[PDB]
Structures are given as structure tokens and as C-alpha cells.
């Protein structure tokens, strides 16, 4: 069967057909590999097929801790009562921890450099090795947990491993929530959509459904339009880290060997901070590094991310563009002229109509990323609605939301309000110069940068058990 090695359309495959005269896949009878997402109710003739979310929907840093018990237990250092997360026993990053290695059957990381023999990393989420920049973020948070547990242990000598792990985990979950809602989401939605979809938090509402909506798994992929074709690495003075400061993305996918053998996470994090993200424009949607060469080193042929997003929406039985515009209370364009008005681009409207025939059939991701960006935001009205609607449910429907009464004390909440990604980076790396807040806006060295020493550390005094 193997959906990766054949183009036969039979369960569980739904390979992407190739159009006549494709600039890359010349043999029209071939395809682009595709496995259908697991059905919630296998082989049913009663239920309307739905997919499954293997993770906790809550912003609880489950990508660090795991969403299943056996895994969560395996990610922990059970050799002592320090409440730490296990670290790599073979390699270190200039004296700093690295994530341990996973034990996979057909490990894709080994394929990215056969001679280096570095497998994929083990994390709370299975995708930690997909791109080194992601791996660096996973590693950053693992170190922060261990740093927190260490400090809490000095603060509270009587606390056992479980208590230390739970309290450190609690702080990390809160840091992800704060950075996400305070620093990230406002820059995604823009001020107007932020106010509309995320009004001031009042209290936990046990009637708010916190589940991830099927459409969100596809809509949140708007982020693929932000991807740059290279992985940028910079040295301590934010200058290109030779001999390879700009590695093509098609050669960093699952390249865990680069983190291990090419200078650790510091050059990668500096690159993320001082390099601009790609801007999504109506005639510059997504790069060929992911459109033509996605996972080139670990697949028979390069994949196409934008195309996979659209095939996935169909696999998931997602309604078209207009249905989602309607759901969001936004006008539904029925003609090319109306679509041209909505997109403020008749040319793109025409292109979409030649392809889809009706705006009713435009795939959610495509129509979503085609819309003009909201002011000071990076998504249009439709994506702003879907994304904004989801995050409010994840905030209001979370019993452990950091601001919820009883989760943290008033003074702990005050301490947590001082956290920032730039400080987190300062605490767990050899980097001494970081971005000014907002870290997601700052992108130019040395203009948008300051000394780590000017940033105060998280005050853990209020965690001392009286």
C-alpha cells in the first residue's frame, strides 16, 4: 500500500493528482504522497467521518510535557527527586542540555545526513525535529523547565520530584499562554480583531467548549505564508555564522544532526530574532522551498505544502470559502466582481475563479490566505474570525488559565506578568544580546536589540512555601 511509494488511490491513501504540464512532475499519471487522516470512527456507515486531535487543546505546553501518560513519564528524569525533564546523554550544546533522542522505526532524521547518524529528538510532540528552528524552541523550553525546577528546589528544599516537576510545568504552561496572548496573537489578528474576538478576560466559563475545531487545523496553517526559504544562523555578534549562514530549507527538514553537530541552538535563535519573516502578499503567497521541495531529503519526491493543505481540507470534509465567510458573518462573494471587491484584487479573484469556478468551492486555506491583511495584523477577516474564535475558547474554557481565580496567587500572577521570550532566551543560552519587546516585531540588529543584563529575571519569591 504505502502512500509514500505508490500512487494507487485506495485506503488509507488519497494521493494528489498531477495537472497536465506540471513544471516539476512531468509524468501526469503520478502523484504527491498523501495519507488520509485517521477517522474518529473507523469503517462506519452511520457516522459522518471526523478526524482526531492527538494533543491537549489547551495552551499548556503539552508539546514539551506530552499529551499521554507513558510519554510524559518517559520525558521525565526519574533517576532523582529533582523534578527534571530527561536530557540527551550523548550530546551537549556548549555545556547546555539538548533533548534526548527518540527511538523511531523509520527515523527520517537519519536520512538527512546518513553519515552523521543523528536520529530525531524525543519531545512532548512528535514533530520537534521537523525544522531546526522548531527544535531550538523545544530545547529552549526544556532548559527553562529544568532551570525553574532547580530554583524551586532551593526555594523549597522539602518539595519532592513530583511537586517540583508540577510547579515548574505550571510556570512553563503560563509562560506559553502569556507570550501567546500578550505578544503573539495581537500581531496576528491586528488590534481590531483582537478587541472583537479576545475581549478582556473575566472568568473561567465551564460552558465554553475548549476543543480544537476541525477548521482551525487548516486555517492556522496561514503561518506557512510566513516561512523564509532559508534557515539563518548568526554568531555572537549577529554576523553570518560561516561557512553556512544560509541553509536552504529543503535541507534542514528533520535535520537534527545540524543542531548536534553545527553549533547548537544559539546561532539558530539569533537567526530567528534578527531575520525578518516573509510577508504574505497576494502574488507572493508561499515559497518554492515548501511548494516544490518540502521534505525532499526524506521522501521519494519533494512535497508541496500549499497543495497538501488544500487536499487535507477535502480529506477533512471542510466547507468552502463562502460557507466559512457566512459562519463568520462576513459577506459571501458570488461573482468574480464581488470576489475582486472582497480581496481588493480583481486579478487574484479571476485566477481563483478560473481554478475553482465558484467562490463556494475555494478551499479554506487558499481563500483565507488570499484575503488582504488586516491593519497591523497578518491575516484577513476570515482567518481572523476562525483563529480569534478558537483562542477565546481556549482561554475562557480553560480551568487552568493562568489568570483564573485559584490557579496562581495574586503575587505569583504579578511575577508572571514580567516574563518574556527575550528573557527566557537570556536564561537558557549563551546569547547575551536579545530583541527588545515585542520580540515578534523586533527583527533588526543592533537597532531592535538590548543587553540581557538590562532584563530582570523572573522573581520566584512568591513560590516559597511559608
Amino acid at each position: 500500500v504505502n502512500c509514500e511509494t505508490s500512487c494507487v488511490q485506495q485506503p488509507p491513501c488519497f494521493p494528489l493528482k498531477i495537472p497536465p504540464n506540471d513544471p516539476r512532475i512531468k509524468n501526469q499519471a503520478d502523484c504527491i504522497p498523501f495519507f488520509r487522516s485517521c477517522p474518529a470512527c473507523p469503517g462506519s456507515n452511520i457516522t459522518i467521518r471526523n478526524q482526531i486531535n492527538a494533543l491537549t487543546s489547551f495552551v499548556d505546553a503539552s508539546m514539551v510535557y506530552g499529551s499521554e501518560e507513558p510519554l510524559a513519564r518517559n520525558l521525565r528524569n526519574m533517576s532523582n527527586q529533582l523534578g527534571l525533564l530527561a536530557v540527551n546523554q550523548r550530546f551537549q550544546d556548549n555545556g547546555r542540555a539538548l533533548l534526548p533522542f527518540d527511538n523511531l522505526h523509520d527515523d527520517p532524521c537519519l536520512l538527512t545526513n546518513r553519515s552523521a547518524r543523528i536520529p530525531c529528538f524525543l519531545a512532548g510532540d512528535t514533530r520537534s525535529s521537523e525544522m531546526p528552528e522548531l527544535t531550538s524552541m523545544h530545547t529552549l523550553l526544556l532548559r527553562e523547565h529544568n532551570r525553574l525546577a532547580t530554583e524551586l528546589k532551593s526555594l523549597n528544599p522539602r518539595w519532592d520530584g513530583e511537586r517540583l516537576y508540577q510547579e515548574a510545568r505550571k510556570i512553563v504552561g503560563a509562560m506559553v499562554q502569556i507570550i501567546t496572548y500578550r505578544d503573539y496573537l495581537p500581531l496576528v489578528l491586528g488590534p481590531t480583531a483582537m478587541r472583537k474576538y479576545l475581549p478582556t478576560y473575566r472568568s473561567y466559563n465551564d460552558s465554553v467548549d475548549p476543543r480544537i475545531a476541525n477548521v482551525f487545523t487548516n486555517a492556522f496553517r496561514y503561518g506557512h505564508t510566513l516561512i523564509q526559504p532559508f534557515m539563518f544562523r548568526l554568531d555572537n555578534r549577529y554576523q553570518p555564522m560561516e561557512p553556512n549562514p544560509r541553509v536552504p530549507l529543503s535541507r534542514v527538514f528533520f535535520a537534527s544532526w545540524r543542531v548536534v553537530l553545527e553549533g547548537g541552538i544559539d546561532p539558530i535563535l539569533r537567526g530567528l530574532m534578527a531575520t525578518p519573516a516573509k510577508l504574505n502578499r497576494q502574488n507572493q503567497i508561499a515559497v518554492d522551498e515548501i511548494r516544490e521541495r518540502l521534505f525532499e531529503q526524506v521522501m521519494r519526491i519533494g512535497l508541496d505544502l500549499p497543495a497538501l493543505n488544500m487536499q487535507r481540507s477535502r480529506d477533512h470534509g471542510l466547507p468552502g470559502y463562502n460557507a466559512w465567510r457566512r459562519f463568520c458573518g462576513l459577506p459571501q462573494p458570488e461573482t468574480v466582481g464581488q470576489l475582486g471587491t472582497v480581496l481588493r484584487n480583481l486579478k487574484l479573484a479571476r485566477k481563483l475563479m478560473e481554478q475553482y469556478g465558484t467562490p463556494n468551492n475555494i478551499d479554506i486555506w487558499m481563500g483565507g490566505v488570499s484575503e488582504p491583511l488586516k491593519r497591523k495584523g497578518r491575516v484577513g477577516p476570515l482567518l481572523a474570525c476562525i483563529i480569534g474564535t478558537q483562542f477565546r475558547k481556549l482561554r475562557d474554557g480553560d480551568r487552568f488559565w493562568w489568570e483564573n481565580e485559584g490557579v496562581f496567587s495574586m503575587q505569583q500572577r504579578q511575577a508572571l506578568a514580567q516574563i518574556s521570550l527575550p528573557r527566557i532566551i537570556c536564561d537558557n543560552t549563551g546569547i547575551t544580546t536579545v530583541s527588545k519587546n515585542n520580540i515578534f516585531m523586533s527583527n533588526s540588529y543592533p537597532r531592535d536589540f538590548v543587553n540581557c543584563s538590562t532584563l530582570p529575571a523572573l522573581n520566584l519569591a512568591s513560590w516559597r512555601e511559608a
Binding site: 487543546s57 524552541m137 503561518g223 488544500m310 470534509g317 485566477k351
Partner: protein, 104 residues
């Protein structure tokens, strides 16, 4: 679900007392709209040759990408107001929210 608790479970279970699997791992996604399949319940649009979608032929995902998504790499526009970290946090956050499993 314990009467009281001090920390989140690993699975997300019990966060919502009345409906304890809400937000928990390995559960079906919630739907904001009814699903739209070729046969009404399972097959995706583009599966069966000749089956249109609402009066029009299903556009090959690769075709839409080729004709609408593709652009000259040297034309890339650096966002003067967003760092690449903005992109990276989005993926890291995505990985805290959802993972749709597939067969191996």
C-alpha cells in the same frame, strides 16, 4: 474527576468537570460546520472521477498551488515588522494545540 486538584492532568482530562474529555487528547475535533464529503459521509472531493462539487469540477490542489501560490523566489518581501521568530512561535504553538494522526 477528583473533587479537587492542583495541577492539569497530562491528557487534559477533567479540565472541564461536566464534560471531562473536552480538550483532552485523542478525541475527535469539534465541528463548527457540517462536513462536506462527496458521498455525504466519508469520501473527499476529488476522489471519484467525474464527480463535481456544487456544479463545478474539483480543482487539483497541485493545480491551484501552481497557478495561484507559486511566485518567483527573488520577489520575496521581507516583513519589516515581523521577525522570523513570529513564524516560529506560530508553529511551536500549533504543536501545543493540534496533531491530526495518520496511519504509518
Amino acid at each position: 474527576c477528583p473533587e479537587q486538584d492542583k495541577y492539569r492532568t497530562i491528557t487534559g482530562m477533567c479540565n472541564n468537570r461536566r464534560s471531562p474529555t473536552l480538550g483532552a487528547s485523542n478525541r475527535a475535533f469539534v465541528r463548527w460546520l457540517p462536513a462536506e464529503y462527496e458521498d455525504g459521509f466519508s469520501l473527499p472531493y476529488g476522489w471519484t472521477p467525474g464527480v463535481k462539487r456544487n456544479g463545478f469540477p474539483v480543482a487539483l490542489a497541485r493545480a491551484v498551488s501552481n497557478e495561484i501560490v507559486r511566485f518567483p523566489t527573488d520577489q520575496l518581501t521581507p516583513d519589516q515588522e515581523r521577525s522570523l521568530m513570529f513564524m516560529q512561535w506560530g508553529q511551536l504553538l500549533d504543536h501545543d494545540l493540534d496533531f491530526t494522526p495518520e496511519p504509518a
